[PDB]
Amino acid sequence: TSVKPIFSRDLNEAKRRVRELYRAWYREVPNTVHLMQLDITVKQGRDKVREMFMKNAHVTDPRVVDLLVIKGKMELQETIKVWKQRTHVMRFFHETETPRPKDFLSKFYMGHDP
Amino acid sequence: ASATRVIQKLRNWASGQDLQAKLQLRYQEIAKRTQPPPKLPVGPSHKLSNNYYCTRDGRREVVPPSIIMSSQKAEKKAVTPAPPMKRWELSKDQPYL
Amino acid sequence: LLKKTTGLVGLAVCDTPHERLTILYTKTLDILKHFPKHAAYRKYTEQITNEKLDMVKAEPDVKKLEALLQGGEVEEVILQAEKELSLARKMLKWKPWEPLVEEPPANQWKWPI
Amino acid sequence: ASNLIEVFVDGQSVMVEPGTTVLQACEKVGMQIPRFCYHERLSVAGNCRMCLVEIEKAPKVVAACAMPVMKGWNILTNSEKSKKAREGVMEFLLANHPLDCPICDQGGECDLQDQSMMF
Amino acid sequence: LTLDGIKDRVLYVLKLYDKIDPEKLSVNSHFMKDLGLDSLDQVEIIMAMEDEFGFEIPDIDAEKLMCPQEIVDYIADKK
Amino acid sequence: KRPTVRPRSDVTHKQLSAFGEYVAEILPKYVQQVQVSCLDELEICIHPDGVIPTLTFLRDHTNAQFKSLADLTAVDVPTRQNRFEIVYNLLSLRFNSRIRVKTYADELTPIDSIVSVHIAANWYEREVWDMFGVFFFNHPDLRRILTDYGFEGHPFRKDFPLTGYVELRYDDEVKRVVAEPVELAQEFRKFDLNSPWEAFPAYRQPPE
Amino acid sequence: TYKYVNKKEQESEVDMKSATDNAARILMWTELIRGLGMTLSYLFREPATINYPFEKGPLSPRFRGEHALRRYPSGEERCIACKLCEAICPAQAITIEAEPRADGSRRTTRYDIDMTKCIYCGFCQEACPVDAIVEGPNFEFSTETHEELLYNKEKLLNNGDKWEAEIAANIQADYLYR
Ligand code: SF4
Ligand code: SF4
Numbered sequence A: 001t002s003v004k005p006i007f008s009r010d011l012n013e014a015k016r017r018v019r020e021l022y023r024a025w026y027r028e029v030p031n032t033v034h035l036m037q038l039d040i041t042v043k044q045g046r047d048k049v050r051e052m053f054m055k056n057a058h059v060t061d062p063r064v065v066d067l068l069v070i071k072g073k074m075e076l077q078e079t080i081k082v083w084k085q086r087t088h089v090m091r092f093f094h095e096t097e098t099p100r101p102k103d104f105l106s107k108f109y110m111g112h113d114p
Numbered sequence B: 001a002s003a004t005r006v007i008q009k010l011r012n013w014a015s016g017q018d019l020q021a022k023l024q025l026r027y028q029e030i031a032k033r034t035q036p037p038p039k040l041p042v043g044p045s046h047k048l049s050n051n052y053y054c055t056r057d058g059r060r061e062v063v064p065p066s067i068i069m070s071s072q073k074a075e076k077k078a079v080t081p082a083p084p085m086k087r088w089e090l091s092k093d094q095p096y097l
Numbered sequence C: 001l002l003k004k005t006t007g008l009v010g011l012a013v014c015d016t017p018h019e020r021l022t023i024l025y026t027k028t029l030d031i032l033k034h035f036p037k038h039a040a041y042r043k044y045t046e047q048i049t050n051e052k053l054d055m056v057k058a059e060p061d062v063k064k065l066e067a068l069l070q071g072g073e074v075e076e077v078i079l080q081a082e083k084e085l086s087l088a089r090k091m092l093k094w095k096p097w098e099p100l101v102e103e104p105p106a107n108q109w110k111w112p113i
Numbered sequence D: 001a002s003n004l005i006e007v008f009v010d011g012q013s014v015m016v017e018p019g020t021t022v023l024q025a026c027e028k029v030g031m032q033i034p035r036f037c038y039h040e041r042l043s044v045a046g047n048c049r050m051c052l053v054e055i056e057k058a059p060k061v062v063a064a065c066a067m068p069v070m071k072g073w074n075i076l077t078n079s080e081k082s083k084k085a086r087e088g089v090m091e092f093l094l095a096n097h098p099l100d101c102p103i104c105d106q107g108g109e110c111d112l113q114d115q116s117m118m119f
Numbered sequence E: 001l002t003l004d005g006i007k008d009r010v011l012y013v014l015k016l017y018d019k020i021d022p023e024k025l026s027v028n029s030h031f032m033k034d035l036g037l038d039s040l041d042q043v044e045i046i047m048a049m050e051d052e053f054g055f056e057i058p059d060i061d062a063e064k065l066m067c068p069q070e071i072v073d074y075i076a077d078k079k
Numbered sequence F: 001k002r003p004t005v006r007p008r009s010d011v012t013h014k015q016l017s018a019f020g021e022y023v024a025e026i027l028p029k030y031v032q033q034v035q036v037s038c039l040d041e042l043e044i045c046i047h048p049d050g051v052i053p054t055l056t057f058l059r060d061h062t063n064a065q066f067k068s069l070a071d072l073t074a075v076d077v078p079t080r081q082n083r084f085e086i087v088y089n090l091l092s093l094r095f096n097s098r099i100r101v102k103t104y105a106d107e108l109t110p111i112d113s114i115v116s117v118h119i120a121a122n123w124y125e126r127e128v129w130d131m132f133g134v135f136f137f138n139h140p141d142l143r144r145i146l147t148d149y150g151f152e153g154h155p156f157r158k159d160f161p162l163t164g165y166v167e168l169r170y171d172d173e174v175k176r177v178v179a180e181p182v183e184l185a186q187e188f189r190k191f192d193l194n195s196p197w198e199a200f201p202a203y204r205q206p207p208e
Numbered sequence G: 001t002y003k004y005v006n007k008k009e010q011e012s013e014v015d016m017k018s019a020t021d022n023a024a025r026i027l028m029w030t031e032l033i034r035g036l037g038m039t040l041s042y043l044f045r046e047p048a049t050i051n052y053p054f055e056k057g058p059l060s061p062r063f064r065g066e067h068a069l070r071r072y073p074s075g076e077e078r079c080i081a082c083k084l085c086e087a088i089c090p091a092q093a094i095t096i097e098a099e100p101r102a103d104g105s106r107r108t109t110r111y112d113i114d115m116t117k118c119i120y121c122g123f124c125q126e127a128c129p130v131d132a133i134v135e136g137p138n139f140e141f142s143t144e145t146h147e148e149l150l151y152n153k154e155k156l157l158n159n160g161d162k163w164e165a166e167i168a169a170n171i172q173a174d175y176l177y178r
């Protein structure tokens, strides 16, 4: 149960890197919304960033947290210099997809998918 | 090929090359679109004897690679992967352009 | 005479190829003397360095020296000696004569699965 | 090794019970001898002659589906004699077999086709 | 160092923060023990301090800036 | 002699075996296995810690001079613990030879990038990261190079589906190119094209 | 061996006549004038343009065009529902469903080939054991809708009945090679 660290010895500086990445994403969201002419507002873009972080927040392996930080830096840098376009940014919101309600009655009425 | 002699001389002088000798438009020298039927030959294995497949099964002669050294299984002069490459000779036909 | 060009872009023409090769091989031997005695890299690199130094000292002609060394042109031989010296320093830092660092898993190199 | 006998498949030693056939010893080692008439839940027939294999220092190939291993036999399964026997038997089957493969329900499920391609 | 000015400017930033209500917030009140926030909420408060003060605060000091009191004396002995 | 069988020269096999012994005894700290195939190709399998010394030695040695990197790739074999096998094919123009260097990694142990040794390793390691998710230490700019912008998942892995998870289409309501969960008008029909009879007895694995 | 494309032997010195030649070359544009002249020569050749659609580009009997399902001279469908064409089809553009016919013959109930998925590689026509599926020489079948390129058995049989006077002749011309 002993492995080689990637960047972080334990969860502490891994969480420090998480906080730095979240800080820079929070900085970049208004610039993203202003530059790429997004229909969304600044508030819900920051909410999207925050709930992405909370989606990934359940992991406590330092290597996995380091790799998630690395991938977040790639996504953020890809947003800094604008290669990721308006469609790629708006892919985070799924506004064109009808969501699937999680109740048994609705999943029974639609089809056989559990 | 239907060009007059005046236009042919003008083209030859203007390009510096003999153009009527090598025309890029094919007129009659190409092969006929209808050909006599062929008869393709057969290969070396088309024989009725001494042709057992085990004697010519190249696919089954492949062996697993020979382990030179393994970490679990396993004064001399230094060597190279091959003798050094011989220097290329200059072209005797046209060495320079 | 002197070579007008080496035939390779970005490679200069060395007007003193014997002295440069001599000092490069001497520096290579001197840095190889710091290696452990049982180092196979030290033994082999000393073998090639000694052979090439002997051939350089034996042949004073540039073209015959290139034909003897058969490593391209003498400028390429000088560049290879420089890279061998840097590699000798890197081997001395890395110490690869030690035993195997960590055994691979049991089916790490088993193909096919 | 009480009531067990040592036999060899391609030089590899293996313990077998008495009455174990050559084909059974070969599949105990891990090689499937070609077969057409042998089924492990049917009685032994021994007629298709596809399981003919060469025993070391034996001039005649034996049918692995019916012949039991005796003692210390070296079963050369991938020998020249065994390959020639398999080639001859498949040639004799496909001599009178009809060219019905596209109109056959046994398209990719054909032991005859697969053993043709393999042996 | 304009202690009262930096103090009520920090309190104004905390009032302006939309997630937390003004009524139970105090100077010595603690972010997770009292206010029920998250570490992400805490670093959002720190970034509000950033863009309202104009000077950088490193990630290291953020885990010590845990009540408005540490914020106000940190800017007091930093400015 | 046989017109249907590829001719075999054993001098290349002897030379590559000698060079494999040479490299193995020069670097016993990292080299884990040395093999020469029936195709006369030398493969040297090393520890991930010795990627930089092995590549530097092969590039800068007088007897090696493997100054040209043929390619850098990864093979996903998801039955072993370190499922990504990183393969470096190198070419020696001085000695007219080719060599292969293998190492291993999994999803959570990155290996050292060799951009300092060969410059094509920049884009090749970018490709390996984009296709397999193998991180590379000390890279100048490791990012995606082939997938879509913001593509989630590494598609050359064995467990990644062939058709993927999302597909793009133009939505007129939002006037954009949007991503949907993938739905195929005709499903890709998988074919079980494996004969139940063993083809090559030379590669017969022993029973478990 | 090897040769030099830009290297020149030794030196041609620096002579006054050579300097005057170079100065005349880059002052009176001699290479420009000769390039103009041979472009004028091509102005005075004959164009290589054929008169489409009244003239057609030459082809070969091997040409892989629009797919078609052939018949025997009796009129029976050549296809025997053996599915090797869809087994070998590298783009998976062939879908086949089959059942015994009322007289018990092994025939297809569905034979769909997607032109928008097909790569026009001839693997079906070279894997067909009875010369049923062919890539006939039709290529002028561009449609205005995506649906019209989704062929079924009726469309393929209609194509085979339409192009049989040419497909059979091409197969007669080329079948000795294959
Ligand atoms: S020509 Fe088209 S239909 Fe025929 S096998 Fe090739 S891709 Fe499939
Ligand atoms: S290969 Fe020929 S006979 Fe067989 S199913 Fe296809 S079209 Fe029909």
Ligand code: FES
Pocket: D034, D035, D036, D037, D038, D045, D046, D047, D048, D049, D050, D051, D052, D063, D064, D065, D066
């Ligand atoms: S399997 Fe038929 S003879 Fe043995």
